[PDB]
Design a protein around this ligand. Structure first.
Ligand SMILES: *S(=O)(=O)N1CCOCC1
Ligand code: SF4
Ligand code: SF4
Ligand code: FCO
Ligand code: F3S
Ligand SMILES: [Mg+2]
Ligand code: NI
Ligand SMILES: [S]
Lengths: 545, 263
């Protein structure tokens, strides 16, 4: 029952970090089997902020959407909110509703794929699933989740047969050199739980198609939606009866999978890995909020987000501070940018790339280091969950308490890698619980009002900010318009907050801090590093842009 | 029994991963059937279990496979500063792609980025990003779009494995999917022909589904099959009231902008 841990002392580099978006190198120093220091080194620069200079502000959303295709949509949304603010247009109610529903659909697609397809292979030994008794697995499945045909012994055996045929083919494909091959002490699950999870991994590949189809009814297509414009949205058909009926039907199927498979699997895995509620914690959390009832200004977004905004520091859940947009800045001291760029508020942002060399601990990442009132901030589902729970948001109180009771852990146990993983599931369940209400609101609004884009005029000179809480956290785009063109356009993205390097004072970012104390059972197969890194759900194309 | 499904090595260079995401939206077949039954997907950073040295070892195992392999490339190649602004396992992306391309049975560029350079190549091109053929002087099968429809990517993969190289146009795109203009199959074409246009997004003409040409639609100059096959079995941009950006055309970020005008 002690967490497995070697006596290894030395360096470990993991490059590539797989099962993330984008290109990350993690370096750690290990002593007596525990990580004592860490570096998060982002390995690709594209320079979208530089590319945007001089362009039409209307074009920004189309470029910035291509910051990332995993968190597709969210940058188009942040850019649209940003330019809307810069031109001082208030979007019509229907456009607020449609934009927020497309975000909801994105949360469902993204979190389902993350848990199963990115994260689960850190906890689930797929080859051990071949050793499971499918009837025992079916019985376990019936005890921990709602009755469903996909959990039958016959269904689970068919999964086992497919996997056996694949493994015995000699071409292991995506499982080649998996850390669990041949057994690994850090993998705790009974074979039956491995089999249930593996069956659901395969089902989730089909279910994510349906989640993307729902999103595309409103968004035009997925990936890379095409329904937002300055002043609102273009998709008049998305306000109408039959499309919204299909959107609801698909969303209900996806939510059934969330409630029948994702949450029960997440809780089952969490129960076996309760030690991971004591590994990977950080202390400060930031959210801009999402799902606002008033998106007429950034301040109204912060105030009216149904998943609320806020700042928590020092794990103090007794106080949530308002977000001060003027207090955000980015450092470059430990990044691959020119000296002189520390301490810049994004309206004054500078993106002047300057590479040095691999593993230069003075300059080791293409990410900037965003800071808030001098502190690093963790953003994402865990940040939203703590902020909402602290404020007594009733859905978060209900679903968090459900998890705390199931696992017999306090809210403080969520300051951890297990907690970060759990929070992603908690908020997915909450989005699901709100879909019918949000769809009905938009259906009723669209039936009585087809205003979807407001009138606006391009100012000669202005500035604006667009805020969103994307699936990975607090996202902001910041524009300076001069001569009716983009003079500066800065993105500050959730993975920038989470996985950027040290700031100007040499202070570790959230992932770097979270990695301190990681036990390493086998330095050649450092799954524990992956568990924590993956729990932040990294997107390096997002983080660097 | 000695068995072998064709080996596919998938590299991610300067990309947003939207092309990987598009590929997994396939339903004919679903991605699980494809990778269990039809191909052996031997390296793919976004979904593979191995990481770090174990992942690099899996790559080398695939590249050295005696049966050979097909190469899928996602993303452009950042060439500035000796390729050092885009690295995997401490190696420049251009170096690894050059090596993999040299011995590949065939090269499929998924997306406008690998085909033609894409978003990071847009002016002023900070990283000196290039398309694969642009950088390496090798011929590629291009499946462009930002991202391409899975129908086009998976269709091309299946075609290459079972029939051979599909007929390609002058931009290296299979005519099966890219032979026709978006516009020629657009349901708003009768409006275009009658010069019935939406003058703004808030207009009654937009609500009525009039043609989006005055709002910048690049359908008339873009080769893709979007209105014919749809995305996600439900929609495409013009059906959602928005002009085509021209996203399957080379260098569209510079040739099709401003997006809301006819430049
Ligand atoms: S536009 O230039 O008027 N458009 C018309 C028809 O086809 C291509 C270009
Ligand atoms: S072609 Fe588009 S969707 Fe594909 S990697 Fe490039 S930017 Fe992303
Ligand atoms: S909306 Fe675009 S593709 Fe359709 S008819 Fe008009 S110009 Fe052509
Ligand atoms: N979610 C998401 Fe992508 C990141 N990090 C953005 O914004
Ligand atoms: S923007 Fe691209 S996805 Fe089709 S509709 Fe135009 S070619
Ligand atoms: Mg930035
Ligand atoms: Ni992303
Ligand atoms: S192979």
């Amino acid at each position: 029952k002690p967490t497995p841990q070697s006596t290894f002392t030395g360096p470990i580099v993991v490059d590539p970090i797989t099962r993330i978006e984008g290109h990350l190198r993690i370096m750690v120093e290990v002593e007596n089997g525990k990580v004592k220091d860490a570096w998060s080194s982002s390995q690709l620069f594209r320079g979208l902020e530089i590319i945007l200079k001089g362009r039409d502000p209307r074009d920004a959303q189309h470029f910035t959407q291509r910051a990332c295709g995993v968190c597709t949509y969210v940058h188009a949304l942040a850019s649209s909110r940003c330019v809307d603010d810069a031109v001082k247009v208030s979007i019509p109610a229907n456009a607020r509703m449609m934009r927020n529903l497309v975000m909801a659909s994105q949360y469902l697609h993204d979190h389902l794929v993350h848990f199963y397809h990115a994260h689960a292979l850190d906890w689930v030994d797929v080859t051990a699933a071949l050793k499971a008794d499918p009837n025992k697995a079916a019985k376990l499945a019936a005890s921990i989740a709602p009755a469903r045909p996909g959990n039958s012994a016959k269904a689970l055996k068919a999964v086992q047969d497919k996997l056996k045929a694949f493994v015995e083919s000699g071409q292991l494909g995506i499982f080649t050199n998996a850390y669990f091959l041949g057994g690994h002490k850090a993998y705790y699950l009974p074979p039956e739980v491995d089999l249930i999870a593996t069956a659901h991994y395969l089902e989730a590949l089909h279910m994510q198609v349906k989640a993307a189809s729902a999103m595309a009814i409103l968004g035009g297509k997925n990936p890379h939606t095409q329904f937002t414009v300055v002043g609102g949205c273009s998709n008049y058909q998305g306000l109408t009866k039959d499309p919204l009926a299909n959107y609801l039907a698909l969303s209900k199927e996806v939510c059934q999978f969330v409630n029948e498979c994702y949450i029960p699997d997440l809780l089952a895995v969490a129960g076996f890995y309760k030690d991971w509620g004591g590994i990977g914690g950080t202390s400060n959390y930031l959210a801009f909020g999402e799902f606002a009832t008033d998106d007429s200004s950034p301040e109204k977004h912060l105030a009216t987000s149904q998943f609320p905004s806020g700042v928590i520091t020092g794990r103090d859940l007794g106080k949530v501070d308002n977000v001060d947009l003027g207090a955000i800045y980015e450092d470059v001291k430990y990044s691959w940018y020119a000296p002189g760029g520390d301490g810049k508020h994004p309206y004054d942002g500078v993106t002047d790339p300057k590479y040095t060399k691999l593993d230069d601990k003075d300059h080791y990442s293409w990410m900037k280091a965003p800071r808030y009132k001098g502190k690093a901030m963790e953003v994402g589902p865990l940040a939203r969950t703590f902020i909402a729970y602290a404020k007594g948001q009733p859905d978060f109180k209900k679903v968090v308490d459900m998890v705390l009771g199931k696992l017999s852990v306090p809210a403080t146990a969520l300051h951890s890698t297990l907690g970060r993983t759990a929070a992603r599931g908690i908020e997915t369940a909450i989005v699901c619980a709100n879909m019918e209400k949000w769809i009905k609101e938009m259906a009723d609004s669209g039936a009585k009002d087809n205003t979807l884009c407001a009138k606006w005029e391009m100012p000669e000179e202005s500035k604006g900010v667009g805020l969103a809480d994307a699936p990975r956290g607090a996202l902001s785009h910041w524009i300076r318009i001069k001569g009716k063109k983009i003079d500066n356009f800065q993105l500050v993205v959730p993975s920038t907050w989470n996985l950027g390097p040290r700031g100007a004072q040499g202070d570790k970012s959230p992932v770097e801090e979270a990695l301190i104390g990681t036990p390493i059972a086998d330095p050649k197969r450092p799954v524990e590093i992956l568990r924590t890194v993956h729990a932040f759900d990294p997107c390096i194309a997002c983080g660097v842009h | 029994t000695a068995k072998h499904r064709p080996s596919v090595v998938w590299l991610h260079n300067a990309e947003c991963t939207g092309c990987t995401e598009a590929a997994i939206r396939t339903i004919k077949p679903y991605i699980d059937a494809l990778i269990l039954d039809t191909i052996s997907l031997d390296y793919q950073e976004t979904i593979m279990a191995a990481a770090g040295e174990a992942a690099e070892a899996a790559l080398h195992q695939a590249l050295e496979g005696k049966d050979g392999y097909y190469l899928v490339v996602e993303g452009g190649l950042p060439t500035i500063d000796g390729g050092q602004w885009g690295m995997v396992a401490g190696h420049p992306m251009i170096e690894t792609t050059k090596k993999a391309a040299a011995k590949a049975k065939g090269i499929i560029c998924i997306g406008t980025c690998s085909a033609y350079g894409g978003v990071q190549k847009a002016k002023p091109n900070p990283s000196q990003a290039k398309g694969v053929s642009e950088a390496l002087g090798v011929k590629t099968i291009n499946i462009p779009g930002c991202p391409p429809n899975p129908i086009n990517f998976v269709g091309a993969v299946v075609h290459v494995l079972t029939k051979g190289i599909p007929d390609l146009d002058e931009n290296g795109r299979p005519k099966l999917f890219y032979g026709e203009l978006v516009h020629d199959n657009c349901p708003r074409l009768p409006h275009f022909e009658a010069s019935e246009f939406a003058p703004s997004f808030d207009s009654e003409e937009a609500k009525k589904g009039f043609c989006l040409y005055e709002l910048g639609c690049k359908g008339p100059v873009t080769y893709n099959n979007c209105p014919k096959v749809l995305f996600n079995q439900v929609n495409w941009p013009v059906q959602a009231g928005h002009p085509c950006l021209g996203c399957s055309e080379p260098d569209f970020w510079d040739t099709m902008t401003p997006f809301y005008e006819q430049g």
